[PDB]
Design a protein around this ligand. Sequence first.
Ligand code: COA
Ligand code: COA
Ligand code: COA
Ligand code: ADP
Ligand code: MG
Ligand code: MG
Lengths: 131, 1033, 249
Amino acid sequence: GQELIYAGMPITEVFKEEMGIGGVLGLLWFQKRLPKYSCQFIEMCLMVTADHGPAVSGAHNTIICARAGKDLVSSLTSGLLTIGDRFGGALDAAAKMFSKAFDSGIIPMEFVNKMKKEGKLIMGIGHRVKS
Amino acid sequence: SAKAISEQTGKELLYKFICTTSAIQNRFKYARVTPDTDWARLLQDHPWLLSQNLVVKPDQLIKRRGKLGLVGVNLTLDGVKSWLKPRLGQEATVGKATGFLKNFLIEPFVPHSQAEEFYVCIYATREGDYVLFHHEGGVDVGDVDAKAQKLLVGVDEKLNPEDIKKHLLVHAPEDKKEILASFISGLFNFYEDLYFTYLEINPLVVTKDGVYVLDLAAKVDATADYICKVKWGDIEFPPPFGREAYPEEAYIADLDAKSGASLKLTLLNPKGRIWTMVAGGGASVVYSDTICDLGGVNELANYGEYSGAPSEQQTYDYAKTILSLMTREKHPDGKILIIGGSIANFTNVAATFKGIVRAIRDYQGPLKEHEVTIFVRRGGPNYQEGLRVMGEVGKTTGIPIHVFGTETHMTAIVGMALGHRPIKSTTLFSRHTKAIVWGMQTRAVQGMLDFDYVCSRDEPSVAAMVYPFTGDHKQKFYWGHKEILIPVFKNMADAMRKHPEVDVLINFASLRSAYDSTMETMNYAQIRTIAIIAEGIPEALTRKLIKKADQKGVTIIGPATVGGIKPGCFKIGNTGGMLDNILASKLYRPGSVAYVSRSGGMSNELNNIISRTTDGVYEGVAIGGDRYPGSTFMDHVLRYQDTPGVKMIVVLGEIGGTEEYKICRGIKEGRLTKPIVCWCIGTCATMFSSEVQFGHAGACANQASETAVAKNQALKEAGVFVPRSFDELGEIIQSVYEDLVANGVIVPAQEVPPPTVPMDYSWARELGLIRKPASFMTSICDERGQELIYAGMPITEVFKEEMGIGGVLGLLWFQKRLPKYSCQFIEMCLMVTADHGPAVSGAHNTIICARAGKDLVSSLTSGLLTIGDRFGGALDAAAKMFSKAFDSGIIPMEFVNKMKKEGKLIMGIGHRVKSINNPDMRVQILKDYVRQHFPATPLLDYALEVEKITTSKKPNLILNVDGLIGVAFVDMLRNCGSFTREEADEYIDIGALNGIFVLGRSMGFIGHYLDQKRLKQGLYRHPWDDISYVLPE
Amino acid sequence: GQELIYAGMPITEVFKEEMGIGGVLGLLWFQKRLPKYSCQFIEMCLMVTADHGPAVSGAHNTIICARAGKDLVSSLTSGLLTIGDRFGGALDAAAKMFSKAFDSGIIPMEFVNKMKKEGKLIMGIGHRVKSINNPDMRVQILKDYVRQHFPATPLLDYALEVEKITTSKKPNLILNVDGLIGVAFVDMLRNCGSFTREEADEYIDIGALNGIFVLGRSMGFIGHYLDQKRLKQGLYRHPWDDISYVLPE
Ligand SMILES: CC(C)(COP(=O)(O)OP(=O)(O)OC[C@H]1O[C@@H](n2cnc3c(N)ncnc32)[C@H](O)[C@@H]1OP(=O)(O)O)[C@@H](O)C(=O)NCCC(=O)NCCS
Ligand SMILES: CC(C)(COP(=O)(O)OP(=O)(O)OC[C@H]1O[C@@H](n2cnc3c(N)ncnc32)[C@H](O)[C@@H]1OP(=O)(O)O)[C@@H](O)C(=O)NCCC(=O)NCCS
Ligand SMILES: CC(C)(COP(=O)(O)OP(=O)(O)OC[C@H]1O[C@@H](n2cnc3c(N)ncnc32)[C@H](O)[C@@H]1OP(=O)(O)O)[C@@H](O)C(=O)NCCC(=O)NCCS
Ligand SMILES: Nc1ncnc2c1ncn2[C@@H]1O[C@H](COP(=O)(O)OP(=O)(O)O)[C@@H](O)[C@H]1O
Ligand SMILES: [Mg+2]
Ligand SMILES: [Mg+2]
């Protein structure tokens, strides 16, 4: 077009309506004009997940790669490719687990015990130091 | 179709599987004798042959053997051998059939009285299976239908044993009723379980000792093979007495059995000069009728058909069989090949004709030697291209081929070749009909939509598709020039629920699952009409479909049909084909003529004929070719009688069954008042010496009344407009029509032009009307062909030439057939670069990745992405640096000093531990191979001179493996003789050397991934004590 | 060390013993000195999987990427990342499927019917053009090799029985190259005598078969990258007339 359109909304309208990164993500991922608290929450998640030091599987790989004299894209992707199972997968895993448990109609205690019997740990539960 | 089995086959099955309280005697006591019998072995296997007297008779589907002196009764083995001496191998003429007596059965003689002989018969009909019994059995029973007690076991009914005693055994001796009732009960269950359609035991003997099955004649429903294979085993279906069995027939039968397509071949006269290769069960019979009407009966070599969209390969295998058969011996007047057919509904004429053309090319020498002339007539999908390739093969081979299309009357080529001429619910569909299509049939759906658009329908006729193998999704289609979406459902229940407007289902399920999916459809009350496409559904299953449909008021069109068409309203699947044919035959608007045919191909020929002779088709239905059509000729004729828009009816009948007589009855009763035109195909069968099963499963006359000749006569007598032959059908339709216009019965509507649909891109390019530029360009591999090609070399040749990995790389990377030493050197490089431990950047990243629980590709690429500069780059760097220096003309010492001045180190020089006196083995291995096999190594020589200098500074400044591979690879490209300097230089520049490292090391990295997984290594996190955190304040 | 060691074997010994690429792969992937027929068969697989034209998901991506002026590694990996499910996954899928079916003890007919009921198609069965009477040459090359050199082929034997069934429905439901490599590789791991059942099963599971395809096809992909560079091919932009834009209102 004569203007860039994000999920039916023109780029000028996107700015005029003060959508923000959260709002833009709403259009491009979900094709929705989300409530402003929802946009703000998305932005908030992107901020707390921004980084967690250079020791983690992904950061380490990017660093190695950067240090092996590679480009931004190569270095970034080399790190991103670790994201998925044992690294960064927990968000999806936790959401899926709890959603299943909830929707199954089992009470939290039944769920806790079900996991123990099945020999599974709860995703999204536990911390190395935080009490 | 129902096929006869030998007496031995039937008895073996009976003895194996019958379940009765009755003690059946002489179980498996039979011995088969042929002219090749090893009597010593026969006697070893059948010692009972010496235990009592015997009976001997041929087992060749010969009826009334006793009356022919062909049953030798109460003989010793010596007597049997003497009886066989003048008979075994002898020719015999039984009626109009003449064959050789080559297969006999020997069984124990069963002494009994004439009073101990009984007659039992079970046979299938639409309404169920009749069970016949007579107490006066044997070689003199006479008319069993009139005499014998008869009992109908309904379609899903069970045979009540009390009914056997009550209705059937009325005249049976009292002391034998219990045993007969038990046997008959078991016999019926056997008949059902093994899919018999006819089972006669005459005589059945019952003595003080038990039950004896003296004779057995039977037919099984051969279409039930997929069910009964296990029980039947390698069941053999013999040719009728008088005909021989040929291996070419068995070959075609095996092809037929392995596909939805229909492939049929029966040899009538291998030495005949008239051969046919016609598409369709209907058209093939019409062409045979025409040939016989023109006096060619004695010279007609075969009867056969191909239909149901066979592939190019299937058509090739079919055609090569015919061509081989017609070039066995020369005929003085040469030979003729008739390649005909209707205007096809969906068979791809180009694909099938390309198969035939390939066979013609392969047999061109013999065809010319045998003076073969070919005549072609065909219409249907891509027929234009089909006709072109036929014409072209004639030109290139010099074989005379005369090619015709839709403008030539179907059977006209026969006269040319022979020198006679020079060269329930009344309304099923409306303009509102919505259908569900079962099966992934996107082409048929698009064809329906193209028809709907030109018919000026408000909405598409297909509301949804059901396909159980995929998940629910939407499929793209075209409504004019507009792209639309049609939903596809995994489950039928979802499609029905979401589309309550649907009252029609078109079932494209294969024969294997059509029964269950049709029964499933009938659980949805919304569905009032079901079209069943599949050919080959067992008759017993179709009867169950009929029972349920009748009780639910559902109209079934099919099985074994293309469907039907209602101009202006609705088109069933492929019926009527593509837009070109819909427009040509004016199928976009209704006329006044309604028709019904068994044949799909012929229904589209009727569309053509009717469009040319009248105001056009009002509605047409193809009932299908099966013995029990879901809806009959009468069912549709009555709908047409009750449809005011219909002014005349056309019926294309067929040999087999007595359906057409219902029309005679309806006229006589005054129910049918509209003019009816009818022609029954299959008049040729009357002239054949043995029974012939035509293409349609139902096209076989089991009684005199079922012949086409008989039916045509009866219809003509009843007042139906019957032509002299199929050739005069068009003439009679036009005559009836013209009389109806004259009498003001019909008022032809003024013609309105229909909506215009764009040509699909596909056809447009094919006819070269448009040109569209390719966005891409490749030169290394071609997968489009009959074989995979790597840079001009076919995959088989790659293997034949023992190219190896190195050779394949030469092809795909350089598009060159490299010298074997060069290939081997490449393989050598991949081997030395395979791995170098887990400590290096890439291996480390792959390992971290595999430990982070990732897949092989993610883990491998995570490590590959470290390749390039500081890691893995040295091969390219060394090659480039040394090549530049060499080519500049500077001597090695000048180069060493230049680099020092420029503040650069020499790439490919240096090692942490390997000294000049302590060499790197990888370097040695390669250096030695290179020196021993390469014709020239100028750059390696230069590099070794540089090494001489550097090692005199520090002993570890040796030429390392990256330098050695780098310069040797340059020497290979430059001096192997496959590349110009320009080419060699380009390949180095574009990074072929980086490719070597990457490809080589990928093996090590995948190795590490597998290792970490097998070593069950947990998530890695780098220790904090190895990280200096220098953050702001 | 003073010498490079591949799974306990020094690099000179590797060359001296004429191990070849197949032999090297034996050591690095499985840590086994495989029979020479097994090595040669591996090399053969890597050759038939080398390439299959520029139309396939992966090749296309590599080409686009090369044309967008990127490096060998970026272009290769951009293509490799498509390998896995609907592209190149079939070898693993077929091997796993047939191995399960075989080991379950169900006869080929039971298996064929089980799949139909479960609403699943057989992985490694079917071809767009190759018929039972018009064979896939890659399948021929390998089938013939294996029949000649594999001492035992139980799973291939089972698969060919399943092929017998499927081809008698529709003639193009042949055992394709992904099915043929899949089952032959299983037969190799199980019957070459270098692996315990447990070992053979672990290797299939951890996706050694995906490795074969990835490694093999990497040659074709690098081939394409080089080709595009040499063909001095410009930046690609997909044409708008091939895209249906179904945006909200
Ligand atoms: C008992 C003891 C040895 C180990 O227990 P611990 O470390 O506290 O607990 P565990 O490691 O067994 O884990 C506790 C529970 O959390 C559960 N759990 C852990 N992580 C979980 C997760 N992410 N999701 C769900 N459940 C989780 C475990 O399944 C376990 O369940 P259970 O108690 O129902 O079996 C320890 O508590 C102890 O030393 N106690 C002192 C006893 C003492 O004084 N001894 C006498 C010396 S004189
Ligand atoms: C002088 C000394 C300190 C360091 O020198 P070194 O390690 O031999 O040499 P360098 O590290 O400087 O490298 C040697 C040369 O190889 C060159 N070089 C290194 N790697 C190279 C490569 N890959 N390609 C090309 N040139 C390379 C360097 O440019 C250098 O060149 P130059 O000699 O012309 O300057 C060391 O030799 C020494 O300790 N000597 C003993 C002196 C002694 O006994 N002192 C008295 C104590 S009482
Ligand atoms: C029936 C027909 C419409 C569609 O059938 P088709 O294309 O041969 O077969 P399908 O698309 O349904 O697939 C055939 C079988 O292969 C199976 N199959 C396909 N790919 C498979 C795979 N990869 N693994 C396993 N099974 C597979 C399907 O499950 C199906 O099984 P089923 O037959 O047991 O249901 C078609 O054969 C036809 O047109 N036949 C001619 C009938 C005729 O002449 N009609 C009368 C006109 S007058
Ligand atoms: N094994 C046998 N023992 C005694 N009589 C037999 C035996 N086989 C046949 N018969 C007699 O021979 C007659 C003719 O043979 P049959 O099998 O009925 O042939 P067809 O019906 O062709 O004439 C039978 O009706 C029966 O009387
Ligand atoms: Mg008899
Ligand atoms: Mg047919």
